[PDB]
DNA sequence: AACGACGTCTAAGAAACCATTAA
RNA sequence: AUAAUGGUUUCUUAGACGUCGUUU
């Protein structure tokens, strides 16, 4: 038999990564990251861990404080991600920054989850057209971003929430489309506007929206291929990721 | 393939049983076509009824009663609702109206009490007004209470519930009670309200509207749930309780206990130790033994919302004999997964998405200890319109169904039994007029009884049945 | 290494209110 | 409270870790 169930999970193929470890609490490291705001990612563990460039660490830490810098090999990335929560967030940021590189896609964070917002100024692009057909009614095209009626100084756009999960020794990336509301402190005022927007997004409409978002995020689907992405390809401590394009699916037993 | 998950399967549908042993998946359609299960035994031979209304609200009760007697037609939903033929036609039992000695009026001081905003005082006054009808316990079966909207101030606040308070206060006096608010009178579609109130009154008069078919006699299903009460001194009193569902010999049993049997006193994490778990499961074992004839359950399907600790697992394993297998599945609602339906190659077009969501009763095994179950989806054969279009119950709320997740802590083998049992237990609720519920009835009854117990600290310890809190 | 006492990360729930009414 | 569950925002709990201490 051929009934099919299609999920919103894409596989992650990389198993091990290399990163910088600096040898000399979490709150002070976060404070230093906030004040410095460098072009690198950092986290606190038994030893302070980072991914990026050495000058960023030089700005972060005084020259008399860094005892040494070494290379840490995080083998079996799924097990390490499952074991610790800090490594989960670090891999989150690494794979996401590798994903959203060299693309006209915004980036916003609410409730400790990551989104991929479509910019207002770059709404009328060629890549942003296949999503406008799925949002559109019948053969017409849909507005991918705009304003909300009876809501002064409050905009809206189409966004997708990106997460990562570990299930049985495998790493999956979760995609789920919502509508992003700016500013963030007044999202409730558009709640009804969201409902009336998604009231008629049935199986086929949601399927097409998901396919369009996958195309926008990756650029190529089909052929059983995978996309290689890079986070910070301008330093010794770089991240290289390989992500599948076909979403996880299943077929009936028959 | 790099992303091909494990093969999925479907368990078709629960089949409800009606009078003269007739199988029907549609509850309302089977009720209208066949008769209720209890009408075969004529256990509620006559559904007597009494009123309890403020000084001038008797007319609303009379009007809803007359609407219950007369037929009605569906207005809002049409692919699921069936025409309501009136109480006598569908349930074969009258609704003889209360006489002059059963149409009591509440004290005029109830409004004065509600003016200040004292929920406990108003509940006590309502119960005291009710107390005059305990003499005529043979003159009526179900009492109807109308709560006017003018009391809306004393309805819910700071963790207080008038509904649970009076349902617990009345419980020692063996008398089912039904509350009718302005919502039931004002709601535009009258067929739904009539169906719901009729089923509630018939089930609370001692009857069995419907019961599931193909149920194994030697099985048990237990579910625990907890409620949180904030104390003055920064405390988090967690009150847990349990509910079991028994097929018995020929009836239906739906009871619910309290865990605070002179033990526990948690005031902390919603988890119980070895002693508390053993004591709680001892009552379940005793009740299963007593309701049946000197026999133990051949299986146990204990469920709850949170996860079992190792001490809890040991207590569950030791509270029962070695001839029984205990599944300790945990139900998780919030999930980051969802699914979409894709149809196969039919005619000449390639694969395409369907116009309706994925089939209800479909499960996907992710790991060896976790699975996804679809309690929401498309049901076939429930369309009162053209009989080829599936029905999605929550199409007006969510455009797509949200799956539930099952995390097993014991057992082995496939997920057929657990998923089939959960989906079957989702349809046996009698308080709701829709097709099913998201969660199995054990969790929902445990949750509502936990709220009831938390509302009244001084709740007497005997075991109540479903009809007294439904 | 003696057992608290205090900070981060995550995953899960429960009160307490809003809303509309099945391609 | 005839009823279904979709949002929003808080709070709590449980794990995982770290840091002086502290006891001894
Ligand atoms: Mg009820």
Numbering used by the authors:
A (entry chain B): 327 to 350, 355 to 584
B (entry chain C): 4 to 473
What is written in the article reporting this PDB entry?
Short prokaryotic Argonaute proteins (Agos) are associated with NADase domain-containing proteins (TIR-APAZ or SIR2-APAZ) encoded in the same operon. They confer immunity against mobile genetic elements, such as bacteriophages and plasmids, by inducing NAD+ depletion upon recognition of target nucleic acids. Target DNA binding triggers tetramerization of the TIR-APAZ/Ago complex by a cooperative self-assembly mechanism, while the heterodimeric SIR2-APAZ/Ago complex does not assemble into higher-order oligomers upon target DNA binding. However, the NADase activities of these two systems are unleashed via a similar closed-to-open transition of the catalytic pocket, albeit by different mechanisms.
The Ago protein and the APAZ domain of SIR2-APAZ, as well as a ~25-bp gRNA–DNA hybrid, could be clearly assigned in the present EM map. The resolved complex adopts a canonical bilobed Ago architecture, with the gRNA–DNA duplex inserted through the central channel formed by Ago protein and the APAZ domain of SIR2-APAZ. The flipped 1A of gRNA is sandwiched between Phe158 and His166, with the 5′-phosphate group recognized in a conserved metal-dependent fashion, similar to that in TIR-APAZ/Ago system. Surprisingly, Arg190 protruding from MID domain orientates the base group of 2U, thus blocking the potential base pairing between 2U and 2’dA. Destabilization of the SIR2 domain is suggested to be required for the NADase activity of ThsA, which is in line with our observation that the SIR2 domain is dissociated from Ago protein and is not visible in the active SIR2-APAZ/Ago–gRNA–DNA complex. Interestingly, a long loop (aa 261–276, termed sensor loop) in PIWI domain shifts away from the gRNA–DNA duplex compared to that in the AF structure. Although the target ssDNA binding is expected to trigger the conformational change of PIWI domain in SIR2-APAZ/Ago system, the corresponding dimerization interface is occupied by SIR2 domain, partially explaining why the SIR2-APAZ/Ago complex does not form higher-order oligomers.
